[PDB]
Amino acid sequence: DQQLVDQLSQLKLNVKMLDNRAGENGVDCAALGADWASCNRVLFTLSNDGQAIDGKDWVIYFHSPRQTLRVDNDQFKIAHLTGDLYKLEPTAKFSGFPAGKAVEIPVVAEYWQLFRNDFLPRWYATSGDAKPKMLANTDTENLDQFVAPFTGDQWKRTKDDKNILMTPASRFVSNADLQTLPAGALRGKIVPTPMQVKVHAQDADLRKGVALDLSTLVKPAADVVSQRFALLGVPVQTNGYPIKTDIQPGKFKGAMAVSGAYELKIGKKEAQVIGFDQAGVFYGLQSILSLVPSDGSGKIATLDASDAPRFPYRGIFLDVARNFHKKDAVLRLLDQMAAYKLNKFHFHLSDDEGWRIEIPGLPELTEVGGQRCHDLSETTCLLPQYGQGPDVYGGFFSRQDYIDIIKYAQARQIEVIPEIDMPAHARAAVVSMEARYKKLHAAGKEQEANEFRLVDQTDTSNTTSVQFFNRQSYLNPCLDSSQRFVDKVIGEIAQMHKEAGQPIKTWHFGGAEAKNIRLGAGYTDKAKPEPGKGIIDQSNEDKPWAKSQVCQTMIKEGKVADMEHLPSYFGQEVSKLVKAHGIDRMQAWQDGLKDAESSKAFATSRVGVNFWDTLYWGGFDSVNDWANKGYEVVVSNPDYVYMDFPYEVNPDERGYYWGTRFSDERKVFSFAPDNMPQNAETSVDRDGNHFNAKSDKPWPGAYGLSAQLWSETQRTDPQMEYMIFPRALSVAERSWHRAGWEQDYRAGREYKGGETHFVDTQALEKDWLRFANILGQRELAKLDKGGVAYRLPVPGARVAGGKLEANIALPGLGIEYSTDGGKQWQRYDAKAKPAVSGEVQVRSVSPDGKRYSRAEKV
Amino acid sequence: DQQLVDQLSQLKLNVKMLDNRAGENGVDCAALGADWASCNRVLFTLSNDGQAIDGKDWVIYFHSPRQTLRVDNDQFKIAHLTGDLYKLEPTAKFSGFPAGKAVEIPVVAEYWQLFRNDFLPRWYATSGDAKPKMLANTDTENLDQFVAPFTGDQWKRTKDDKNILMTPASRFVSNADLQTLPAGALRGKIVPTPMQVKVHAQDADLRKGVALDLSTLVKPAADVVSQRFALLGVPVQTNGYPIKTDIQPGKFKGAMAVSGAYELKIGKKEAQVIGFDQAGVFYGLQSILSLVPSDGSGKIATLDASDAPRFPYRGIFLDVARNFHKKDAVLRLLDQMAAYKLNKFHFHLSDDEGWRIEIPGLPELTEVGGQRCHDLSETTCLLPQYGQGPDVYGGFFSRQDYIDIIKYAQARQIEVIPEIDMPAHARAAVVSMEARYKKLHAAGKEQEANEFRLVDQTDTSNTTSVQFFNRQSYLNPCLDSSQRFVDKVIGEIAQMHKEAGQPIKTWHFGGAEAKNIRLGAGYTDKAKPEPGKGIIDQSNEDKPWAKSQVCQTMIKEGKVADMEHLPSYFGQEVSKLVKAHGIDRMQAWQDGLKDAESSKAFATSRVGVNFWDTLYWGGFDSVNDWANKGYEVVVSNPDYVYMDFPYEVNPDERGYYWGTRFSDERKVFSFAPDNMPQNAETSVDRDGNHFNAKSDKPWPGAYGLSAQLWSETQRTDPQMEYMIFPRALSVAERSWHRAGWEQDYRAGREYKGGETHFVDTQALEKDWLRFANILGQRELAKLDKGGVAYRLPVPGARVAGGKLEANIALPGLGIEYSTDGGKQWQRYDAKAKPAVSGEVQVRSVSPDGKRYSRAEKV
Ligand SMILES: CC(=O)N[C@@H]1[C@@H](O)[C@H](O[C@@H]2O[C@H](CO)[C@@H](O)[C@H](O)[C@H]2NC(C)=O)[C@@H](CO)O[C@H]1O
């Protein structure tokens, strides 16, 4: 009853990693069904400061990105619901949570959990008809309340992991090659770096305002510029320092004759921006804005520049489906994107755990798909996921909200690319359409109920997606109703784009991995075990839709060759619908198009691919084939531009890490997207090891670059901003500028990490030093003004001769230190290092002095 | 002597624009007498690869649409003869064209010359009794032989010109909103769009021929249909797919009860056409024909349609006077007109530089008026004009040729409307009648000599027409002999119409601007200069006929109020003669009727007006008054339907451009003729700027739409066809169909370009996309079969990711590209874009693969 839920809600949870490499230390992970025989042991401790909890009629629900394989306290048992949702229950041996006692429940989980952020908050208790209530100490974003610190080598994935744990001591080394440059050494440095620029000794003076001739821009775009001068402290007045604008395409030739190109002259009494087009004028103005200093001095260098995109597609991807992000955060994101010339906003509006766009005619997509709550019947919500608690959690963009975002993006030269995943990663749609089916069927409106249904009633397939959902994660690609659904959705969103003044150019249909993970290579069948693989019963595992009778008949009539080809087939069909709706470009994650012959297989005249192989797994060679088959490659490599991954290897950092252990501003910046093999000399793999890379194939070139904020653990808007910024500035730099150290691709050139010296690292490090300093001494202050909760890097620090030496990943940022265990903080001055003894802590401070990085012991 | 002419003929001319905005860069254009103080500087270079040319007894004649105001090489001087004819001569300082030297002669000309087509070919040399010989490198239609390319911003009319120069790069953008539609998306699409239509899933099969029941049509009309099925590859056999026809007016009601209306049913085994009248049956058959595909498949969609004219008058105007166009080209034009339901052929048979209709009794009109040759005495020819060389150039339709054309038009439901200009634009008649006078006077037949004379012997008026002719361009409206001439001409042409079986319904008397341009607002008098105007001596400038003593006496007796009213008076008098000849409708360009009280002032029961004001000069408001005064408005706006203007803003394109800088298929199609103000949201003005439009007056509606091919620079038949087609298809569409995006006119509604959003642009663009695709994938192939040398649009192209992306104004057309500077050409395939580096050129190809657009560098 409710009293039982009450008692359980007051149990205090503690989560403690015991062994991240349990298979290396005896546990038979293979027998437990762990992928590649890899598993970890964790201790869940439930402490009871109240009276005995002896009731047996209860379930405790919790979330985890890892499956639970074994429970080592025989009073309890754990089962999986679907996705990340699990349940802990008493067994027949349960004898209660004794008064004033801590109950230990050791468990084994698949893989490893290398960051504390793996452990999700908001466990909750239930009991016959009572209402669900969270275990209170878990109702928080502060992991310290319920997750013990990692100790020793618990951060290591394997005994041979070569990654470097970051602490003040090791981080000092990681930063040592850097230094703070004098303001005089950073004059006329536009970000992103301009193609050609000549800075002159003198500075224009903008302190008395500027006179802006913005007649070349449509009003909304002009307003964006005017407002940014004001945000940056530069008055806009008719008697200010002139800034003239003009548009003349003919003035541009060759590679410079492209949208966004401009010519810029900053003189000591006036300024001039000549654009290839409106975007070019706009970017020319952003460059002037990038020079505005953070000291309010208003002085910028006189200079002469010519500038143009290396790539037409400079993207930022944002997942609002796993966890929602409010309209105001999207707008802030779009503001910074404009500031750094990123022009493409790839909007991941649906996935298995949420559907975030209102669709006229299909209310259930947002009424049910737009929220998660504990309703085991998923009639009013999707099941809870991602540690947001058992109560209703969610949100979605109204039709007006969405039109508003498109207008906002467009004023800023950013194109909105809507992504609606299918056939995989569609659980929100499927479950919502099942609720619609059920509701309309109840009223006896069977044709209306079946109009948009995404389930084949006959399908009993047994498949598991990458996030551990079942067949409901997959929309059925063989139903006429599924095509009615896709048509309806494209139709509705395209109309919003037309009303917002930016007709869709590209439709992104997802195309994520649509396979049953239980048939993957790391699992083995129980009949005949092969060592080192997770032993499971594969005799009832199917391929997606294998038991769908509609698909079976579709194959039989000759529409599709077999079940394996359904995903490919579905992508060709979506392309027809995209085209039928007047959209002539389609885009997808690579898996959704791999089985296609080439780009000629699609109805649209252009097909883009979000290339997401890692390099250490051969992505430096598989990328080629995509361009050579006629697809436009949007470089989206997870080992460099997945912004849901950690900034640094430290178990207190946020992020998933399946593709690599960390990607900091420096790493993102060091990535050479158009000569993938060269990255072997400038980066290490997921385990910190050197790798080699070479391709013998032709490489026509990449179409664009895109960085991704997936949102599994970015539960709040602040967390989203911490993960995106400031590394998205590095993304903008590389997306816009081809550096000298980025070599032309050479078929047959083999780069060997730690062995070959083809790459001009001297030039790379100098470029990075200057960029880091621009971020530290100037741009982060602008991010402050923008209201984005960017990540402040923790200092690097060491004690030598009894004094503190500190350094930072983004030189220019203030560093503070504390000798009293963090009670009182003092400014660190490099040219007057402090004498210290005993425990010392360090932290960095934002330019406006209001925010701090986390603090760490030296 | 002849040796001198020989030497000069071998000089090689080069024409190079130096400054199209000379007045903005210091030249005092006002002082030079330039209209509105606007002038341009051009370099004429004469290169001599032979021995020295030191003779002084020579004149070099050349043509230009602009007057020469100054010569900046004091060895030479230039004078104007009349019209476009000028002469370059040595001065007393001339010291010869040195051997192996290029002589530079910079000149200043009035206005601007924005297209290379402004410069006319066939300069020629003369010298005492020798025979005239052209400078050989100028004897060509290929401007590249003697006119340098334009560079930089030489295409701009003013420093603020906002037009967009079209190059592959900018044209790609201009075309980007378009795409190629799948054949399946273009089923049952009749052109022009039918009023009501319902397409069904199935296709009739015409590959085995059709069985045509054409008993509803008179033989000649039936033959036209039979032949078109054959041209389009559809056999006509008694055992083919039936196509029945019937005429029943009663079957039509309301707006649909009009000539040309029909009902059409296309079934899978037979077809049915029910016409309001013969024209309606004929149009019903053209609609079936419009559906015949270009793949020879013979498949057309089953459908049910109701269709009728929005306007009774759907005109194509053709000038054969400035430059002649052969009977075969007129016939081809009439063929295409029938195909697209255009039913009115406005035949501009006379003007100042030619008279093209044989008139029994007045042989001099064609013997002298029908040819131009270098005879300074204009006894056997009119003076040379329009760069056709010094030898005899011309032609004219015999009485039989003309009767033949009328018969041909009539079989095709097209009415021939003859235009004989007067009182202005009559130099051919005046000079021919002066030669008749002189000849008959020589024989002592003074009454015969004076019978048809168009000159008052006493008239010493000093006036200048728009094309820079003097008083001989104006027939004298006060002479009895002039009325004898007009009566004779109407009498003779009306009889041809009766013999051809199509009695004239409308007589068009021209009524072009009959004023002395030297008294216009842009000129000022030298006594008292006002700034910004061309300074001239206006003390000897008169109004037309001011010095005619016959007119002075006509005014004195009370027949006409003053000289200013002579043109108005003459139009009332012509109306009496038109009526006396049994013609009950008269038509004119607006200026010829503006001074009239209203339509009640004319003898005919109907008076039409070719409305030709531009919209940005207030035509959206002045049009109203014409209908409200009882005239039938034939919309002929030069800013949209003057087909002598350029398809696109590029200095290598052909066309005059005084009313607007370009009118492409899209623009013609976007024109809303019956709600003129709405064009403010869908077009820009002559300088590429937005304009506003609103009328508060009543607007009963337009009578018709007419597109005009004036022929100053359309020197050949091919050029005539390039200028008419394919934009005349857009003309036919709009002349026949009122689109949904064409709003009802609303008094007081102010459309503001770039500000108001009243017009459904979404619907306009979708309509245009479909139309463009119909032209590209189907109709242009028919134009090929028709033998018309239509204009092929140059591709739009860009390079991204190192691959070529190309697009086209008329989707469906093949695109080719060259990477070897145009030596070898390859087909462009959108779904397999080519990897390119360095210089790339693009061109489009006609559906039959035999013709190409001009090529341009990407
Ligand atoms: C717990 C964990 O790390 N699971 C991995 C998945 O996150 C990952 O899925 C891909 O990466 C994104 C997270 O970075 C996912 O949000 C997204 O669904 C998916 N990306 C695409 C394009 O499908 C998969 C990749 O195989 O690996 C898991 O182990």
Ligand SMILES: CC(=O)N[C@@H]1[C@@H](O)[C@H](O[C@@H]2O[C@H](CO)[C@@H](O)[C@H](O)[C@H]2NC(C)=O)[C@@H](CO)O[C@H]1O
């Ligand atoms: C060189 C030039 O552009 N001159 C213009 C004249 O062509 C133009 O005359 C009108 O336009 C037609 C050409 O489009 C002429 O052939 C025709 O004589 C005349 N049309 C009518 C109905 O009279 C005049 C218009 O004012 O402008 C000149 O600048």
